[PDB]
């Protein structure tokens, strides 16, 4: 088994550190496809992405919103890129009218005569798939956190009452599977100060975890800090600037394209300069995972 010697720290006040040296998490979110190759996880294609990312100054990748191919883990191990490995997007509720997404299966039990192997099978699929990923990557120096979900309460139908209890279940399963890494998630409801988000973030922190906020600005980072002094936080998903390559005849956001000037972002996000400015000024914001590093299908 491949191994590397390192330790990390997340501090509520001063942010992230690697082997005792303070370090900014200069990260991108990456989806899994490889462009014209479709979903095929070809090793050189994946390596080429990491190379191009590194030349930009990237030192970290968030595998949004699902386990990485082993090939990525291999490459980051050799290249020195810090990986936040995300396991899930939705939990037990489907998003965006996607009636056959994993929201259907998350909380289903596993048949006794189903011989599938890789993780624990004594509870639900969520436990099996969570443990199976951790089992695969528990020794990899590159992986520094397990992310347990993303915007779990977004795009779904019905009450969010049961979500705090589900989060705690996942946090307990992770701590029991691997005691050596913090767990985390990306929550977009923190910026809205939902009751469930406060409960969930407090439970993260109580188990040695780190809280990811999606799409907070500077003013909101500050509110989080004052409201939750015990949280160690970072921007788990940032910017969502929207741009085409090579478009100059307008600087603001007919040809079905968008300006290449950094003056265009989705309503909930921010342009690149803004999302960076807000983070780099704040030692207590450990870093940023920009949405996204590569365009995806």
């Amino acid at each position: 088994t491949e191994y590397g010697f390192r330790w990390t720290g997340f501090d509520a006040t001063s942010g992230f550190s690697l082997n005792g040296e303070k370090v900014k998490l200069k990260g991108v979110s990456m989806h899994h496809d490889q462009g014209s190759l479709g979903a095929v996880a070809n090793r050189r294609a994946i390596e080429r992405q990491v190379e191009i990312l590194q030349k930009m100054g990237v030192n970290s990748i968030r595998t949004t919103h699902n386990p990485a191919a082993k090939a990525l883990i291999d490459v980051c191990n050799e290249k020195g890129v810090l990986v936040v490995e995300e396991v899930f997007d939705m939990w037990n509720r489907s998003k965006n009218g996607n009636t056959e997404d994993y929201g259907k299966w998350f909380g289903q039990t596993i048949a006794g005569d189903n011989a599938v192997l890789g993780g624990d099978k004594d509870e639900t699929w969520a436990k099996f798939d969570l443990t199976s990923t951790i089992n695969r990557d528990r020794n990899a120096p590159s992986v520094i956190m397990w992310s347990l979900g993303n915007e779990m309460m977004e795009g779904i139908s019905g009450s969010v009452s049961d979500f705090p209890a589900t989060s705690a279940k996942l946090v307990a399963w992770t701590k029991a599977a691997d005691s050596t890494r913090p767990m985390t998630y990306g929550d977009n409801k923190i910026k809205a100060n939902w009751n469930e988000s406060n409960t969930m973030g407090d439970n993260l922190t109580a188990n040695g975890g780190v809280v990811g906020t999606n799409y907070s600005d500077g003013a909101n980072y500050d509110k989080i800090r004052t409201t939750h002094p015990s949280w160690a936080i970072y921007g788990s998903e940032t910017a969502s600037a929207i741009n085409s390559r090579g478009i100059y005849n307008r600087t603001t956001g007919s040809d079905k394209q968008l300006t290449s000037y950094d003056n265009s972002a989705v309503g909930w996000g921010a342009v690149a300069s803004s999302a960076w400015y807000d983070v780099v000024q704040r030692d207590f914001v450990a870093g940023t995972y920009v949405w996204t590093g590569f365009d995806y299908l």
């Binding site: 600005d217 500077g218 003013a219 909101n220 509110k223």
Partner: protein, 275 residues
């Protein structure tokens, strides 16, 4: 403004990019109201002076009509002002003003010559589009001389932390100046401090007197008050004394001016600065 965000000055010019309509039948307080055919105007603005003279009006007030005028301004408040307080200040509106913000009626003000204000905080959309509306009703005859009509003086926005000096919140007295002139002069101050947060504040004031324009390096007196707890949602008058070292007199031939600056501290950090 077209957009409000940090960091404009605490008090900033709000005169630009309004829309105006003269009509005593229109009802245009809703933010979704179509004002695309309205005039674009910068304030200060007088809508009597643009109308025609008429023998049906009064010689007393220059034979010019008054009337009902509506002012609309749509502007963005950026997300970065989220926990801040926002107020709009009118140095004068002639007369009978009615003010709405995002569709909510805030209140009214009859007198055409006195300054007034409205807190906008409770109705603001942070990180969105906002619409302030002012209805003005100069119903004639209201004056012995030409009054004019509308928002004829400047308009400002005031943006502050939850802990802040109140509106016009410092009073200064120098009751022994005549005797103390040329030596140490006793300034007796009273400062209203408001705590519009949900927790008690440990408040000290750092007050400085220095020549206008003008840096704090050249102060002639400062004081720091003892810590006073002001409860969440409460305000208090805070008395303080500044000993001013031989201030220069304000006279007709030499009108020396000073800035008196108030910094509000809670715990160890400055949250508000009032000159």
């Amino acid at each position: 403004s077209s957009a409000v965000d940090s960091k404009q000055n605490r008090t900033s010019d709000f005169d630009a990019n309004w829309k105006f309509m003269l009509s005593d039948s229109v009802q245009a307080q809703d933010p979704a109201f179509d004002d695309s055919a309205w005039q674009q105007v910068d304030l200060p603005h007088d809508y009597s002076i643009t109308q025609k003279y008429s023998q049906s009006n009064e010689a007393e007030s220059a034979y010019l009509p008054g009337g009902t005028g509506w002012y609309r301004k749509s502007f963005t408040i950026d997300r970065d002002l989220a926990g801040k307080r926002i107020a709009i200040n009118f140095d004068g509106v002639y007369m009978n003003a009615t003010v709405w913000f995002n569709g909510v009626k805030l209140g009214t003000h009859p007198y055409g010559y006195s300054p007034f204000s409205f807190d906008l905080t409770g109705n603001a959309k942070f990180g969105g589009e906002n619409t302030i509306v002012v209805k003005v009703e100069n119903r004639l005859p209201s004056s012995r001389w030409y009054s004019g009509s509308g928002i004829y003086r400047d308009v400002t926005l005031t943006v502050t932390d939850g802990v802040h000096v109140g509106n016009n919140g410092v009073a200064i007295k120098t009751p022994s100046l005549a005797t103390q002139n040329g030596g140490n002069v006793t300034m007796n101050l009273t400062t209203k401090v408001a705590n519009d947060t949900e927790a008690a504040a440990n408040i000290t004031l750092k007050q400085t007197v220095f020549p206008k324009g003008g840096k704090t390096d050249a102060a002639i007196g400062t004081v720091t008050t003892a810590s006073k707890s002001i409860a969440a949602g409460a305000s208090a008058d805070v008395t303080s004394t500044i000993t001013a070292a031989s201030p220069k007199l304000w006279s007709i031939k030499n009108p020396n001016l000073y800035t008196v600056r108030t910094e509000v501290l809670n715990g160890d950090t400055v949250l508000d600065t009032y000159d």
